[PDB]
C-alpha cells in the first residue's frame, strides 16, 4: 500500500497514529480499541497502548501471516490455517480451541470474542454474555463470510445474512432484502451492515444516523466496514462515511484500495 490514512475518534491511545514502518507496503490493517495492527510482507506490526499484551507479538507472527483481526483487548492472526491469539483473555477470547488450529479460511474479532471460518463452519470463542459466541446451527455450514460486533456476530450463508447475539436495537433482526444475494457483512455496536451486489444495506439503531445509508452507497460499492457507531463504504476507490457525524476527508476521496474500521478510528489503505 503506497500509503495509509487513519482518521476519526479521539485517538486517545494513539490507535490512529500509524508509525512509519507501517506507512507503505501494508497489505491489511486491523483496528482494536487501544491498538492497531498492520500486516506487512507476512509480518504483524502494531501500535498504540499495550495495556493487555495485545502488542506483545508472538514469534509466529513475525512472518508468513495471511490475515489479522483485533478486538477490544486482543489480537488475532491467521497463519497456515491456524488461528493465533494474544492479549487480554479474561473472557477466554485468546484461548484458541483445537478445532481452529488448522484448516481455518478466515477470522474475525468481536469486542471480547474471536471467530474462525473453517470449511464453511463458524467457530466462536470468548465472551458469551449476550449469546455472541453461541453459533446458530445455520452458521455451522455453508458460511462464506463473517464478522464480530460488540455484543453480536454476523455471517453470510447461501447469500443470506445470519445474525446472533444482542438485539436491543434490532441489530440482529435481518431484513428481507439481506436474505439473498449478500456478499459481505459488518457489525457495529447497535447496527449491522450487509453488502448486496454493490448496495449497502443497514439495520438496527439509527439514533446516531448509523443506518442512514448515503445515496452514493446504494450501488457500485466494492467493500464495507463498521466501527462501533459509524460505518464505511469503498466505491471506485473513494471512501464513503456515515453515522456519528463521521466524514471522509479529502485524503481518502480517491485511490483507496481497502478500508478497515476500528471501534473509533477508521483506516484506509491506498494503492
Amino acid at each position: 500500500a503506497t500509503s495509509v490514512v487513519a482518521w476519526g475518534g479521539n485517538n486517545d491511545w494513539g490507535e490512529a497514529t500509524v508509525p512509519a514502518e507501517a506507512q507503505s507496503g501494508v497489505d491489511a490493517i486491523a483496528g482494536g480499541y487501544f491498538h492497531g495492527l498492520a500486516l506487512k510482507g507476512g509480518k504483524v506490526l502494531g501500535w498504540g497502548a499495550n495495556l493487555n499484551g495485545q502488542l506483545t507479538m508472538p514469534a509466529a507472527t513475525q512472518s508468513g501471516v495471511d490475515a489479522i483481526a483485533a478486538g477490544n483487548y486482543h489480537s488475532l492472526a491467521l497463519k497456515d490455517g491456524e488461528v493465533i491469539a494474544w492479549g487480554g483473555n479474561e473472557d477466554g477470547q485468546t484461548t484458541v480451541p483445537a478445532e481452529a488450529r488448522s484448516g481455518v479460511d478466515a477470522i474475525a474479532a468481536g469486542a471480547w470474542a474471536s471467530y474462525a471460518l473453517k470449511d464453511g463452519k463458524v467457530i466462536a470463542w470468548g465472551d458469551d454474555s449476550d449469546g455472541q459466541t453461541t453459533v446458530p446451527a445455520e452458521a455451522q455450514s455453508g458460511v462464506t463470510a463473517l464478522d464480530g460486533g460488540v455484543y453480536t456476530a454476523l455471517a453470510v450463508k447461501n447469500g443470506g445474512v445470519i445474525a446472533w447475539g444482542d438485539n436491543y436495537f434490532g441489530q440482529t433482526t435481518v431484513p428481507a432484502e439481506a436474505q439473498s444475494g449478500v456478499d459481505d457483512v459488518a457489525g457495529g455496536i447497535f447496527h449491522s451492515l450487509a453488502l448486496k451486489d454493490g448496495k449497502v444495506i443497514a439495520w438496527g439503531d439509527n439514533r446516531y444516523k448509523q443506518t442512514t445509508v448515503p445515496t452514493e452507497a446504494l450501488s457500485g460499492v466494492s467493500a464495507i466496514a463498521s466501527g462501533e457507531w459509524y460505518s464505511l463504504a469503498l466505491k471506485n476507490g473513494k471512501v464513503i462515511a456515515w453515522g456519528s457525524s463521521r466524514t471522509a476527508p479529502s485524503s481518502v476521496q480517491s485511490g483507496v484500495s481497502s478500508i478497515e474500521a476500528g471501534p473509533n478510528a477508521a483506516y484506509a489503505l491506498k494503492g
Binding site: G9, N10, D12, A49, Y168, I189, Y208, E228, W229
Partner: protein
C-alpha cells in the same frame, strides 16, 4: 517564556492556552490564561473531585446499574459492564482512566448534571466554567460557543484546589490523584514533555475543531507539585491535533520553573 509559547502556536497552526502554578514558590506561568476553550474530557477529573466532595468513601462501593439504552460512544469500560453494573468508584475511575464517556455521564448525573457540576464549581469561586451538555455532544467546540468551556486559569485553579488544596481532605485527594496516575491517555501530552523521573497525574482532553487539552498535577523528585493546565484548538472543525504541541508547551513550563 511567552516567546516560546507564541512560536509553538505558529509551529502547530493552533491557538494555545496555558496556566501553571509551582506550589513550592507560588510562582505562576500564563499564556492566554483567560481565553475560552472547550474543556472536553478534562472535566472528568474535576467532576470526580466534586463527586468525592459530596460523598463518603463508603459510598463509592455502591453498585450502579445501567442498560444498553444508556451507552454513548467512547465507552470501552462501561460497555463491557453493561447490565451487571459497576461501583460508583469504578465509574469515576473509568471516566478518569479511560476517558469513558458513559462513565462521564453517570458522574454528571451523580452530581446533578452539567449544571450541578457548574454549581459546585461556582461554590468554589469559579465563575468562568460553563457546563451545559452531557457526552458526547459537549465536545462540539464551535468557535465562539461558550457552552462547555473554560479557561486554562480557571481549570488549573480548580485542579489545584482538588489535588493540592483544601477542596478535598487528604485521603480523598489521594484517591483522586491515584485515579489520575499511570494512564495511557496521558502518555503523549504533559508526561511526554517532562523529565522521566517526574511523576505525572493527568487528565487528557480531545474534541472537535482540533481541541486537544491536558491538565495535571506533577511532582519533580525533590519538590512540591506543579499544577498545569494546557488547552489548545484549531480553525477547522475537522482539524487533526498534534500531541507535540502539548508536550512541547510542557517542556517550556519545566524550563521556566527550573
Amino acid at each position: 517564556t511567552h516567546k516560546e509559547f507564541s512560536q509553538l502556536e505558529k509551529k502547530f497552526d493552533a491557538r494555545l492556552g496555558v496556566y501553571a502554578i509551582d506550589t513550592g514558590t507560588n510562582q505562576t506561568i500564563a499564556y492566554r490564561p483567560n481565553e475560552r476553550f472547550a474543556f472536553a474530557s478534562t472535566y472528568k477529573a474535576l467532576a470526580a473531585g466534586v463527586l468525592l466532595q459530596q460523598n463518603s468513601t463508603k459510598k463509592l462501593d455502591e453498585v450502579i446499574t445501567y442498560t444498553k439504552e444508556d451507552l454513548v460512544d467512547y465507552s470501552p469500560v462501561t460497555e463491557k459492564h453493561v447490565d451487571t453494573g459497576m461501583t460508583l468508584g469504578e465509574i469515576a475511575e473509568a471516566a478518569v482512566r479511560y476517558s469513558d464517556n458513559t462513565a462521564g455521564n453517570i458522574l454528571f448525573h451523580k452530581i446533578g448534571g452539567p449544571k450541578g457540576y457548574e454549581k459546585a464549581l461556582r461554590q468554589m469561586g469559579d465563575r468562568v466554567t460553563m457546563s451545559d451538555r452531557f457526552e458526547t455532544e459537549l465536545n462540539e467546540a464551535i468557535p465562539g460557543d461558550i457552552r462547555d468551556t473554560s479557561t486554562a486559569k480557571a481549570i488549573a485553579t480548580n485542579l489545584k484546589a482538588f489535588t493540592a488544596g483544601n477542596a478535598l481532605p487528604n485521603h480523598k485527594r489521594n484517591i483522586l490523584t491515584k485515579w489520575m496516575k499511570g494512564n495511557a491517555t496521558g502518555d503523549k501530552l504533559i508526561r511526554a514533555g517532562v523529565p522521566t523521573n517526574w511523576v505525572v497525574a493527568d487528565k487528557s482532553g480531545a474534541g472537535s475543531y482540533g481541541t486537544r487539552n491536558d491538565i495535571a498535577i506533577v511532582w519533580p523528585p525533590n519538590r512540591a507539585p506543579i499544577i498545569i493546565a494546557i488547552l489548545s484548538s484549531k480553525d477547522e472543525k475537522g482539524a487533526t491535533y498534534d500531541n507535540q504541541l502539548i508536550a512541547e508547551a510542557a517542556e517550556v513550563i519545566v524550563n521556566a520553573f527550573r
